[PDB]
């Protein structure tokens, strides 16, 4: 947030509002919606952007990802993920156990194929829970398994 | 030297050391009751055999039973007597094959191999990029100066 | 041991003083890090530059004002009281003879072991554009501490708003052996064993895995068992969606 | 390293080299007499009058001949049998460091009872006891297999030798580079 005074003057100049999403006041809603017209004074209409040089943009792209394991990904998370792989194998089995039990009760209670059920989208939610979760658990056991050994000699 | 002997003890020099120096060892008339010195010979032999098998597990992974009897100063029947008390009391463990005459360490596989023991291979390359990255600048200092 | 934590506020601040001062390769911008070196985790929450002048003709000639060092450290105490003098940072890709003579300056007002930092604006090769080193003597002995970057909640999230794997890992791993090979050959002709002894320790420690090779393949099959079951689940949705796609086509024919 | 300090003449260098030499006779730790040769000592002292023990015991840990050193010395150090025992450890430790990667090509660690008996000039009974005493002193680690005649010793004691690891390190460089052109470019050109 910012503030800038206007009072008398500041007119007979270039176009302040036309820049970014100004000329507003549908209902009272803008920003914090405690403002409407006056805001602090006159609706200075802040515009917040950012610009950086070629050196600054090159940094945060490669530097900032999640945390720093970088420069070698092989052995840093290898021992940590492999040690919990025995427990992960047992935890992913429970997720599959509750998968088909939802789809089994889904088609068992519907003999109609109409909507009295306020079920407007029933299947896609539970279908994605059995898909996206399955799609999440298998890819982390494959893509990581390729670099989990890579021993050669 | 007797305390550190149990680690390297082969029981080859055991009868030699007790004869030359026997202050508390063989003949002891102080603070020990008895009708003879036979109690010193039996009690001391029980301790040197238990410590003999203990260090073999940390040194020899696999050893022939025929050679083990000569190292323990025992026989076929006397060898199974002392090792039975060590395993039953929960001290150490070993492998005894009567028909095969094979004595091994019996390395436990309960560690799930790669799931655990891989922790020894992470420290190999942990110092790889760290040591090289430090020497790149250090070598250029002596080359430039 | 100890680790060096460099906040993104400090890394981006040192890069600003380089462009604004029009610093060429003949000069190196020097600055002072601020933080807490007492604990094992060394965090730098503040950085500022200094009117430093470099002379390439004489490595013993440097211009540094100690008045601006004590004044700015005292005036910045009003912001946070956790900011003290843990060391200093300077620019340039390499460490010249002028950097060794300036190490004993800040040691007078510094209690614990000072911390040195090298900021590289070019960032040529591998990672770590900013390398940290400690200055301690028994002859100057420098040790490289692990360099990590951790910021506050609003600082780490603010980076994501401004920006709104396996192949790279294999490329840098192959270059590690190429760069190490050049360091051994150049050191071989330089002497004609102590430095090579440390590299031999890491290099020595299906060669040693032959005993675990049999148990490794048995574990890889168990991993495929889970992948085979998850693949069948994804295959059932393909047939389920194929039948579901026909139900939409059946409504288009009647209607 | 002291350049400026510790002013010393040729008289005290021979007295200093005496305590440095005798320390390595029974010393089984930190390489061997060759470290004293690495420093400017042997070049600054006389080559005879029992100062040549560094030169005689250097090759004595390779060829394994005890008659060369024992003939040129006196009865002072030859009376103690422990001195003859420690000379057997350093002789085998040179070959035991070759088990993983120093010289040997295939880089596979295996040792039998026959191969180690000829290198140490000792029978099969005395070589089994010599390895057990070497690990007991903290110099080595590992286990011993008498059933299949296998000796597995973990690497502990470092060495200052070099030049033989450059070619074998290239093996990891060339073999892994082939996967960059084949496997590496396969995933990238996907």
XYZ file of C-alpha atoms in Angstrom:
743
model
C 0.000 0.000 0.000
C 0.964 3.643 -0.479
C -0.480 7.138 -0.246
C -0.032 10.385 -2.160
C -1.812 13.692 -1.594
C -3.476 15.673 -4.384
C -5.682 18.459 -2.944
C -5.772 21.403 -5.404
C -3.814 20.960 -8.616
C -2.188 17.859 -10.108
C -4.756 18.119 -12.912
C -4.274 19.509 -16.436
C -1.616 16.824 -16.952
C -1.176 13.321 -18.358
C -3.680 10.526 -17.735
C -3.315 9.064 -14.249
C -6.212 6.544 -14.172
C -5.954 5.002 -17.643
C -2.680 3.227 -16.744
C -3.757 0.184 -14.690
C -7.320 -0.969 -13.885
C -8.585 2.424 -12.704
C -11.940 4.119 -13.428
C -13.717 1.875 -10.955
C -16.293 1.960 -8.199
C -18.674 -0.788 -9.262
C -20.660 -1.080 -6.031
C -18.203 0.008 -3.313
C -15.696 -2.773 -3.959
C -12.034 -1.931 -4.465
C -8.914 -3.158 -2.642
C -9.660 -3.181 1.100
C -13.176 -1.775 0.376
C -12.851 0.757 3.209
C -11.960 3.375 0.586
C -14.480 3.776 -2.277
C -13.701 7.212 -3.732
C -11.415 9.079 -1.345
C -9.122 6.256 -0.157
C -6.753 8.450 1.859
C -7.081 11.386 -0.556
C -8.296 11.425 -4.171
C -7.518 7.765 -5.114
C -3.876 7.976 -6.160
C -4.325 4.474 -7.694
C -1.039 2.761 -6.877
C 0.600 0.604 -9.553
C 3.112 -1.985 -8.333
C 5.372 -3.668 -10.901
C 8.964 -4.904 -10.950
C 11.884 -4.775 -13.381
C 15.343 -6.321 -13.084
C 18.531 -6.495 -15.127
C 19.855 -9.533 -16.986
C 22.126 -10.484 -14.074
C 19.421 -10.322 -11.396
C 16.958 -12.429 -13.397
C 19.617 -15.095 -14.000
C 20.044 -15.588 -10.235
C 16.645 -16.320 -8.683
C 15.631 -18.622 -11.553
C 18.413 -21.155 -10.948
C 19.016 -20.302 -7.277
C 15.482 -20.479 -5.851
C 13.631 -23.760 -6.371
C 12.655 -25.453 -3.083
C 15.701 -25.901 -0.837
C 19.425 -26.297 -1.577
C 20.530 -29.793 -2.472
C 21.692 -28.499 -5.782
C 24.683 -29.142 -8.022
C 24.455 -32.868 -7.273
C 21.022 -34.397 -6.709
C 22.220 -38.026 -6.619
C 23.378 -38.878 -3.093
C 21.868 -35.991 -1.099
C 18.294 -37.305 -0.931
C 19.245 -40.878 -1.884
C 19.850 -42.187 1.641
C 17.008 -40.147 3.160
C 14.400 -41.392 0.677
C 15.675 -44.983 0.592
C 15.635 -45.287 4.393
C 11.935 -44.350 4.458
C 11.118 -46.412 1.351
C 10.329 -49.414 3.562
C 7.737 -47.359 5.446
C 6.561 -45.686 2.228
C 5.815 -49.093 0.690
C 3.472 -49.852 3.597
C 1.774 -46.437 3.554
C 0.974 -46.447 -0.175
C -0.794 -49.794 0.276
C -3.375 -48.235 2.610
C -4.173 -45.540 0.037
C -5.078 -48.227 -2.503
C -7.170 -50.078 0.092
C -9.526 -47.095 0.421
C -9.572 -46.557 -3.360
C -11.845 -49.318 -4.673
C -13.994 -49.242 -1.520
C -15.284 -45.813 -2.560
C -16.016 -46.873 -6.145
C -17.673 -50.078 -4.916
C -20.196 -48.191 -2.772
C -20.595 -45.589 -5.534
C -22.174 -47.869 -8.154
C -23.938 -50.074 -5.586
C -26.381 -47.426 -4.323
C -27.403 -46.000 -7.732
C -29.892 -48.043 -9.765
C -31.370 -44.913 -11.393
C -28.799 -42.930 -13.394
C -30.649 -39.675 -12.734
C -30.118 -36.896 -10.202
C -32.099 -36.946 -7.011
C -28.732 -37.351 -5.297
C -27.410 -33.727 -5.392
C -24.480 -35.573 -6.971
C -23.950 -33.053 -9.749
C -20.397 -34.256 -10.209
C -20.165 -37.445 -8.140
C -17.674 -39.597 -10.093
C -14.888 -37.216 -11.113
C -13.980 -36.333 -7.520
C -13.539 -39.925 -6.338
C -12.161 -40.955 -9.738
C -9.402 -38.342 -9.468
C -8.672 -39.427 -5.888
C -8.011 -42.930 -7.243
C -6.088 -41.505 -10.234
C -4.067 -38.444 -9.183
C -2.992 -40.168 -5.964
C -2.061 -43.277 -7.953
C -0.368 -40.987 -10.485
C 1.527 -39.346 -7.606
C 2.692 -42.532 -5.867
C 3.991 -44.372 -8.940
C 6.035 -41.529 -10.453
C 7.942 -40.942 -7.205
C 8.852 -44.656 -7.146
C 10.130 -44.595 -10.755
C 11.770 -41.254 -11.560
C 13.575 -41.405 -8.212
C 14.391 -45.091 -8.747
C 16.371 -44.246 -11.882
C 18.815 -42.165 -9.833
C 18.404 -44.382 -6.752
C 21.201 -46.652 -8.002
C 22.996 -45.418 -11.170
C 26.070 -47.178 -9.785
C 27.578 -48.783 -12.914
C 31.188 -49.202 -11.758
C 49.578 -56.296 29.491
C 47.172 -59.000 30.692
C 44.149 -56.718 30.232
C 45.094 -55.915 26.629
C 46.086 -59.560 26.089
C 42.500 -60.800 25.688
C 42.141 -58.898 22.406
C 45.196 -60.477 20.745
C 45.228 -63.670 22.836
C 45.878 -66.777 20.734
C 46.415 -68.952 23.853
C 49.830 -69.859 22.421
C 51.844 -68.093 25.146
C 49.256 -68.648 27.900
C 51.175 -71.492 29.648
C 54.463 -69.594 29.248
C 53.376 -66.318 30.866
C 51.815 -67.993 33.911
C 55.047 -69.838 34.741
C 57.455 -66.883 34.693
C 55.232 -64.323 36.468
C 52.504 -65.734 38.737
C 51.941 -63.118 41.472
C 48.136 -63.421 41.513
C 47.857 -65.875 38.629
C 48.691 -69.526 39.382
C 49.962 -69.731 42.975
C 48.170 -67.207 45.203
C 48.185 -67.646 48.986
C 46.754 -64.171 49.701
C 43.004 -63.523 50.046
C 42.133 -66.843 48.360
C 41.092 -70.030 50.121
C 41.623 -73.465 48.634
C 43.298 -76.866 48.879
C 45.447 -76.374 45.749
C 46.062 -74.103 42.761
C 43.642 -76.018 40.508
C 40.987 -73.343 41.090
C 43.271 -70.692 39.583
C 43.809 -72.846 36.484
C 40.114 -73.558 35.878
C 38.756 -70.082 36.658
C 41.342 -68.248 34.547
C 40.831 -70.593 31.586
C 37.088 -69.873 31.491
C 37.678 -66.135 31.022
C 40.407 -66.363 28.369
C 38.247 -68.637 26.198
C 35.194 -66.361 26.324
C 37.344 -63.366 25.373
C 39.025 -65.451 22.659
C 35.769 -66.168 20.820
C 34.637 -62.568 21.371
C 37.496 -61.043 19.366
C 37.303 -63.710 16.638
C 33.823 -62.429 15.771
C 35.353 -58.973 15.232
C 38.317 -60.331 13.224
C 37.697 -63.738 11.592
C 34.367 -63.805 9.762
C 34.728 -67.464 8.739
C 37.048 -70.004 10.372
C 37.409 -73.778 10.309
C 36.217 -75.575 13.439
C 39.321 -77.790 13.371
C 41.506 -74.688 13.683
C 39.199 -73.155 16.304
C 39.757 -76.062 18.708
C 43.527 -75.516 18.626
C 43.131 -71.784 19.294
C 40.789 -72.307 22.269
C 42.924 -75.041 23.909
C 39.896 -77.345 23.993
C 38.499 -80.463 22.309
C 35.398 -81.290 20.271
C 33.305 -81.795 23.414
C 34.915 -78.992 25.439
C 34.436 -76.386 22.692
C 30.632 -76.678 22.640
C 30.481 -76.256 26.434
C 31.791 -72.685 26.673
C 30.124 -71.337 23.519
C 26.731 -72.638 24.673
C 26.809 -70.394 27.754
C 27.733 -67.262 25.783
C 24.764 -67.545 23.412
C 22.221 -68.655 26.028
C 23.064 -65.728 28.332
C 22.724 -63.213 25.491
C 26.374 -62.147 25.267
C 27.525 -62.966 21.725
C 26.518 -65.244 18.858
C 28.381 -67.462 16.409
C 27.957 -70.285 13.897
C 28.612 -73.925 14.819
C 28.341 -76.644 12.157
C 28.988 -80.104 13.585
C 28.999 -82.130 10.317
C 30.588 -79.358 8.227
C 33.151 -78.209 10.846
C 32.476 -74.585 9.875
C 32.448 -71.659 12.322
C 31.300 -68.303 10.948
C 30.180 -64.913 12.253
C 26.569 -65.270 11.004
C 26.170 -61.682 9.850
C 22.546 -60.588 10.445
C 20.589 -59.629 7.326
C 17.796 -57.983 9.365
C 19.169 -54.540 8.410
C 17.351 -54.749 5.033
C 20.592 -54.054 3.117
C 20.235 -50.982 0.886
C 17.364 -49.645 3.015
C 19.809 -49.034 5.891
C 23.452 -49.950 5.227
C 23.611 -47.485 2.306
C 24.377 -44.766 4.891
C 28.065 -45.695 4.533
C 28.128 -44.669 0.850
C 26.678 -41.172 1.317
C 29.817 -39.940 3.116
C 32.033 -41.098 0.232
C 31.044 -38.327 -2.195
C 29.925 -35.898 0.526
C 33.544 -34.693 0.718
C 33.948 -34.905 -3.077
C 32.601 -31.556 -4.284
C 33.589 -29.927 -0.976
C 37.300 -30.794 -1.057
C 37.721 -30.124 -4.788
C 35.938 -26.771 -4.598
C 38.295 -25.661 -1.830
C 41.451 -26.759 -3.674
C 40.572 -24.946 -6.921
C 41.228 -21.568 -5.296
C 44.066 -22.837 -3.087
C 46.102 -24.203 -6.004
C 45.736 -20.960 -7.976
C 47.237 -18.988 -5.073
C 50.551 -20.859 -5.144
C 50.591 -20.802 -8.956
C 50.023 -17.048 -9.172
C 52.386 -16.114 -6.341
C 31.168 -27.994 12.762
C 29.697 -24.659 11.664
C 27.685 -23.681 8.595
C 27.243 -20.374 6.767
C 23.671 -19.258 6.037
C 23.465 -16.451 3.463
C 20.086 -14.764 3.174
C 18.867 -13.738 -0.305
C 18.808 -10.146 0.977
C 22.598 -10.234 1.364
C 23.337 -11.955 -1.954
C 21.260 -9.443 -3.927
C 22.666 -6.467 -1.996
C 26.286 -7.234 -2.905
C 25.328 -7.449 -6.588
C 23.873 -3.922 -6.489
C 27.041 -2.158 -5.306
C 28.961 -3.630 -8.257
C 26.846 -2.084 -11.026
C 26.145 1.263 -9.343
C 29.838 2.005 -8.712
C 30.799 1.008 -12.293
C 33.360 -1.415 -10.870
C 35.550 -2.968 -13.566
C 37.863 -5.983 -13.298
C 40.563 -3.727 -11.801
C 38.545 -3.136 -8.604
C 36.722 -5.357 -6.112
C 33.880 -4.080 -3.942
C 34.445 -4.853 -0.250
C 31.664 -5.007 2.328
C 30.792 -6.083 5.860
C 28.470 -8.953 6.763
C 26.341 -8.663 9.906
C 24.940 -11.514 11.962
C 25.478 -13.883 14.879
C 28.560 -16.131 14.853
C 28.093 -17.390 18.429
C 26.051 -20.500 17.616
C 27.003 -23.153 15.068
C 24.570 -21.656 12.520
C 26.034 -18.453 11.061
C 23.283 -16.283 9.560
C 23.894 -12.948 7.825
C 20.860 -10.653 7.996
C 22.540 -7.438 6.800
C 25.220 -6.277 4.377
C 26.668 -2.947 3.266
C 29.573 -1.784 1.120
C 32.558 0.432 1.966
C 34.640 2.993 0.039
C 37.373 0.506 -0.868
C 40.114 1.183 -3.420
C 42.230 -1.575 -4.972
C 45.747 -1.244 -6.402
C 47.044 -3.993 -8.687
C 50.612 -2.647 -8.734
C 51.068 -3.213 -4.979
C 49.062 -5.824 -3.083
C 49.933 -4.133 0.232
C 48.176 -0.871 -0.739
C 44.492 -0.750 0.207
C 42.228 2.162 1.153
C 39.768 1.413 3.961
C 38.236 3.863 6.440
C 37.745 2.480 9.951
C 35.489 5.411 10.892
C 32.721 4.302 8.521
C 33.112 0.743 9.844
C 32.299 1.534 13.480
C 29.763 4.285 12.739
C 27.563 2.288 10.357
C 27.631 -0.749 12.654
C 26.497 1.468 15.541
C 23.817 3.310 13.554
C 22.291 0.067 12.233
C 21.802 -1.279 15.772
C 18.484 0.599 15.965
C 16.992 -1.755 13.349
C 17.891 -5.097 14.946
C 20.056 -5.773 17.993
C 21.120 -9.190 16.640
C 23.437 -7.599 14.041
C 27.104 -7.565 15.070
C 30.453 -7.876 13.268
C 31.020 -11.504 12.257
C 33.343 -10.722 9.348
C 33.372 -9.047 5.955
C 32.791 -9.772 2.272
C 34.529 -8.689 -0.924
C 34.035 -9.021 -4.670
C 36.107 -10.519 -7.469
C 36.336 -14.053 -8.850
C 39.748 -14.849 -7.344
C 41.727 -14.353 -4.134
C 44.825 -12.227 -4.737
C 47.688 -11.296 -2.418
C 45.828 -8.147 -1.327
C 43.095 -10.261 0.293
C 45.492 -11.981 2.706
C 46.860 -8.715 4.126
C 43.398 -7.244 4.827
C 42.279 -10.245 6.904
C 43.850 -8.977 10.148
C 42.015 -5.627 10.134
C 38.519 -6.542 11.361
C 39.988 -9.148 13.745
C 40.598 -6.404 16.328
C 36.895 -5.674 16.910
C 35.744 -9.251 16.180
C 35.441 -11.652 19.114
C 34.902 -15.064 17.498
C 36.526 -16.316 14.292
C 35.766 -13.864 11.452
C 33.974 -15.054 8.321
C 35.121 -14.297 4.771
C 32.808 -14.187 1.755
C 33.580 -13.962 -1.968
C 30.836 -12.569 -4.216
C 31.007 -13.452 -7.920
C 28.907 -11.338 -10.274
C 29.673 -13.540 -13.295
C 29.049 -16.953 -11.659
C 31.109 -18.986 -14.118
C 30.849 -22.749 -13.630
C 29.073 -25.189 -11.291
C 27.019 -23.639 -8.468
C 27.624 -21.442 -5.419
C 28.069 -17.879 -6.746
C 29.071 -16.869 -3.192
C 31.723 -18.934 -1.400
C 32.398 -18.605 2.331
C 35.706 -19.229 4.103
C 37.019 -18.933 7.660
C 40.318 -17.274 8.611
C 42.242 -19.064 11.369
C 45.920 -19.659 12.130
C 47.823 -22.252 14.143
C 50.391 -19.711 8.605
C 46.905 -18.815 7.393
C 44.627 -21.859 7.120
C 41.303 -21.385 5.327
C 38.436 -23.879 5.517
C 35.326 -23.921 3.329
C 32.124 -24.127 5.377
C 28.893 -25.488 3.852
C 26.973 -22.683 2.153
C 23.193 -22.720 2.601
C 20.481 -20.119 2.012
C 17.541 -19.720 4.405
C 15.281 -16.681 4.796
C 12.159 -15.719 6.734
C 8.585 -16.550 5.717
C 7.798 -13.297 3.899
C 11.265 -13.190 2.308
C 11.111 -16.656 0.728
C 7.531 -16.179 -0.486
C 8.314 -12.751 -1.946
C 10.784 -14.360 -4.351
C 8.120 -16.654 -5.824
C 5.876 -13.681 -6.635
C 8.662 -11.987 -8.613
C 9.284 -15.121 -10.715
C 5.589 -15.697 -11.493
C 16.733 -32.435 -13.083
C 18.205 -35.820 -13.987
C 20.126 -34.540 -17.019
C 21.636 -31.605 -15.113
C 22.687 -33.934 -12.284
C 24.649 -36.126 -14.709
C 26.385 -33.189 -16.414
C 27.833 -31.678 -13.233
C 28.780 -35.147 -11.973
C 30.849 -35.811 -15.105
C 32.573 -32.418 -14.894
C 33.669 -33.227 -11.338
C 36.114 -35.829 -12.639
C 37.341 -33.555 -15.443
C 38.087 -30.664 -13.078
C 39.755 -33.008 -10.580
C 41.962 -34.520 -13.294
C 43.337 -31.097 -14.243
C 44.115 -30.292 -10.599
C 46.244 -33.434 -10.234
C 48.221 -32.970 -13.461
C 48.976 -29.298 -12.784
C 50.011 -30.081 -9.201
C 52.233 -32.934 -10.409
C 54.398 -30.624 -12.533
C 54.204 -27.876 -9.888
C 56.087 -29.881 -7.249
C 58.794 -31.188 -9.588
C 51.633 -35.335 -1.765
C 49.790 -33.646 1.096
C 47.188 -32.005 -1.154
C 46.752 -35.177 -3.221
C 46.349 -37.165 -0.002
C 43.000 -35.521 0.728
C 41.738 -36.194 -2.802
C 42.934 -39.804 -2.573
C 40.880 -40.231 0.611
C 37.641 -39.409 -1.219
C 38.575 -41.169 -4.468
C 39.371 -44.451 -2.707
C 36.394 -44.357 -0.328
C 30.557 -53.222 -9.116
C 33.780 -52.777 -7.141
C 32.728 -52.648 -3.478
C 29.034 -53.305 -4.234
C 29.546 -56.853 -5.552
C 28.442 -58.245 -2.182
C 25.345 -56.007 -2.214
C 24.679 -56.431 -5.951
C 22.704 -59.638 -5.366
C 20.544 -58.004 -2.688
C 20.098 -54.855 -4.795
C 18.356 -56.601 -7.700
C 15.950 -58.299 -5.281
C 14.916 -54.900 -3.902
C 14.464 -53.415 -7.384
C 11.941 -56.144 -8.220
C 9.871 -55.347 -5.119
C 9.815 -51.706 -6.235
C 8.490 -52.801 -9.632
C 5.761 -54.823 -7.892
C 4.291 -51.594 -6.518
C 4.735 -49.869 -9.886
C 3.026 -52.755 -11.696
C -0.026 -52.520 -9.427
C -0.264 -48.735 -9.789
C 0.014 -49.103 -13.571
C -3.009 -51.423 -13.657
C -5.028 -48.855 -11.693
C -4.203 -46.230 -14.323
C -5.174 -48.723 -17.039
C -8.632 -49.293 -15.536
C -9.437 -45.579 -15.804
C -8.640 -45.673 -19.530
C -11.292 -48.337 -20.142
C -13.677 -46.576 -17.751
C -13.234 -43.273 -19.593
C -13.616 -45.003 -22.969
C -17.027 -46.319 -21.912
C -17.853 -42.926 -20.388
C -16.954 -41.187 -23.659
C -19.519 -43.348 -25.466
C -22.280 -42.225 -23.086
C -21.713 -38.667 -24.318
C -21.788 -39.861 -27.934
C -25.028 -41.774 -27.322
C -26.701 -38.560 -26.138
C -25.563 -36.695 -29.263
C -27.201 -39.240 -31.581
C -30.617 -39.198 -29.894
C -30.645 -35.432 -29.287
C 56.790 -25.560 8.111
C 59.063 -23.051 9.824
C 61.057 -20.810 7.502
C 61.989 -17.913 9.833
C 62.410 -19.670 13.180
C 64.164 -22.609 14.862
C 67.754 -21.731 14.062
C 69.675 -24.998 13.774
C 73.118 -26.077 12.583
C 74.323 -29.383 11.148
C 75.196 -30.612 14.654
C 71.654 -30.476 16.051
C 70.074 -31.749 12.817
C 71.808 -35.095 13.346
C 70.628 -35.164 16.967
C 67.095 -34.253 15.876
C 67.101 -36.901 13.135
C 68.030 -39.484 15.786
C 64.759 -39.078 17.691
C 62.860 -38.848 14.395
C 64.366 -42.098 13.089
C 63.984 -44.199 16.254
C 60.359 -43.056 16.500
C 59.642 -44.847 13.208
C 61.417 -48.123 14.071
C 58.613 -49.377 16.319
C 56.058 -46.874 15.008
C 53.422 -48.670 12.928
C 51.358 -45.515 12.318
C 51.439 -42.689 9.765
C 53.349 -44.096 6.756
C 57.033 -44.956 7.433
C 60.609 -43.626 7.378
C 59.953 -42.142 3.928
C 58.232 -39.209 5.630
C 61.585 -38.252 7.156
C 63.019 -38.365 3.629
C 60.208 -36.130 2.347
C 61.525 -33.395 4.671
C 64.991 -31.892 4.064
C 66.704 -34.113 6.642
C 68.505 -37.030 4.981
C 70.115 -34.608 2.519
C 71.383 -32.495 5.443
C 72.882 -35.380 7.455
C 75.533 -38.065 6.946
C 74.738 -41.244 5.008
C 76.528 -43.699 7.341
C 77.142 -44.452 11.041
C 73.645 -45.938 11.493
C 71.993 -42.946 9.798
C 71.311 -45.038 6.667
C 68.473 -47.030 8.281
C 66.020 -44.971 6.212
C 67.567 -46.225 2.962
C 67.879 -49.872 4.023
C 64.396 -50.190 5.539
C 62.830 -48.426 2.539
C 63.396 -51.393 0.218
C 63.175 -53.856 3.126
C 59.401 -53.265 3.180
C 59.224 -54.307 -0.499
C 61.720 -57.119 -1.146
C 61.313 -58.303 2.450
C 64.936 -59.185 3.237
C 65.808 -59.011 6.942
C 69.470 -59.992 6.467
C 70.444 -56.635 4.936
C 69.336 -54.470 7.871
C 70.256 -56.856 10.700
C 73.831 -57.258 9.425
C 74.642 -53.525 9.372
C 73.172 -52.726 12.813
C 74.395 -53.469 16.340
C 72.974 -55.791 19.010
C 71.126 -52.944 20.762
C 67.952 -52.913 18.641
C 68.223 -56.527 17.432
C 67.751 -57.997 20.923
C 64.117 -56.829 21.113
C 61.976 -59.189 18.984
C 59.223 -56.550 18.763
C 61.284 -54.586 16.226
C 61.253 -57.554 13.841
C 57.476 -57.855 14.305
C 56.577 -54.285 13.312
C 58.638 -54.611 10.119
C 56.198 -57.294 8.929
C 53.174 -54.992 9.255
C 54.485 -52.127 7.116
C 55.598 -54.613 4.450
C 52.076 -55.993 4.005
C 50.303 -52.632 4.393
C 51.784 -51.524 1.057
C 50.015 -54.364 -0.767
C 46.845 -54.139 1.344
C 46.228 -50.556 0.200
C 46.198 -51.820 -3.408
C 43.031 -53.854 -2.809
C 40.494 -51.207 -3.843
C 41.991 -48.500 -6.077
C 45.668 -47.627 -6.312
C 47.419 -49.645 -9.023
C 45.392 -52.757 -9.933
C 43.179 -52.229 -12.964
C 39.836 -53.994 -12.462
C 39.520 -52.321 -9.018
C 37.972 -55.481 -7.519
C 38.944 -56.196 -3.909
C 39.880 -59.841 -3.364
C 42.768 -61.505 -1.539
C 43.578 -65.191 -1.122
C 45.950 -66.942 1.272
C 48.398 -67.956 -1.471
C 48.793 -64.508 -3.051
C 49.445 -62.781 0.282
C 51.875 -65.488 1.443
C 54.289 -64.844 -1.435
C 54.156 -61.054 -1.031
C 54.879 -61.085 2.720
C 57.411 -63.965 2.533
C 55.454 -65.740 5.278
C 53.594 -69.076 5.361
C 49.808 -69.426 5.424
C 49.729 -69.882 9.212
C 51.775 -66.782 10.079
C 49.975 -64.490 7.621
C 46.584 -65.160 9.235
C 47.943 -64.076 12.626
C 49.713 -61.037 11.152
C 46.494 -59.569 9.730
C 44.609 -60.081 13.001
C 47.292 -58.213 14.953
C 47.300 -55.410 12.369
C 43.576 -54.742 12.805
C 43.844 -55.044 16.598
C 46.273 -52.098 16.654
C 43.760 -49.828 14.899
C 45.651 -49.681 11.596
C 43.074 -51.664 9.596
C 39.503 -52.976 9.721
C 37.378 -55.624 8.029
C 36.929 -59.367 8.353
C 38.641 -62.561 7.169
C 37.152 -65.540 5.300
C 39.088 -68.787 5.727
C 36.415 -70.950 4.067
C 36.644 -69.400 0.588
C 40.116 -67.909 1.256
C 38.967 -64.288 1.109
C 40.436 -61.274 2.913
C 38.313 -58.117 3.175
C 40.155 -55.211 4.820
C 38.604 -51.760 5.083
C 40.763 -48.841 3.975
C 42.050 -46.824 6.943
C 45.714 -45.817 6.729
C 46.297 -43.287 3.911
C 49.369 -43.005 1.694
C 51.332 -40.151 0.123
C 51.985 -41.943 -3.181
C 50.371 -40.701 -6.385
C 50.552 -40.929 -10.165
C 48.953 -44.382 -10.411
C 45.424 -43.078 -9.723
C 45.265 -40.782 -12.768
C 44.774 -43.566 -15.320
C 42.234 -45.491 -13.233
C 40.239 -42.345 -12.454
C 39.895 -41.892 -16.222
C 38.040 -45.225 -16.275
C 35.197 -43.618 -14.322
C 35.431 -40.606 -16.652
C 35.286 -42.497 -19.960
C 32.759 -45.167 -18.957
C 30.337 -42.584 -17.547
C 30.805 -40.280 -20.552
C 29.478 -42.983 -22.888
C 26.125 -42.831 -21.085
C 26.012 -39.063 -21.668
C 26.064 -39.550 -25.447
C 23.760 -42.609 -25.389
C 21.536 -42.523 -22.299
C 22.060 -38.822 -21.599
C 21.042 -37.713 -25.091
C 18.162 -40.217 -25.157
C 16.212 -38.480 -22.383
C 17.106 -34.996 -23.638
C 16.043 -35.633 -27.234
C 12.759 -37.097 -25.972
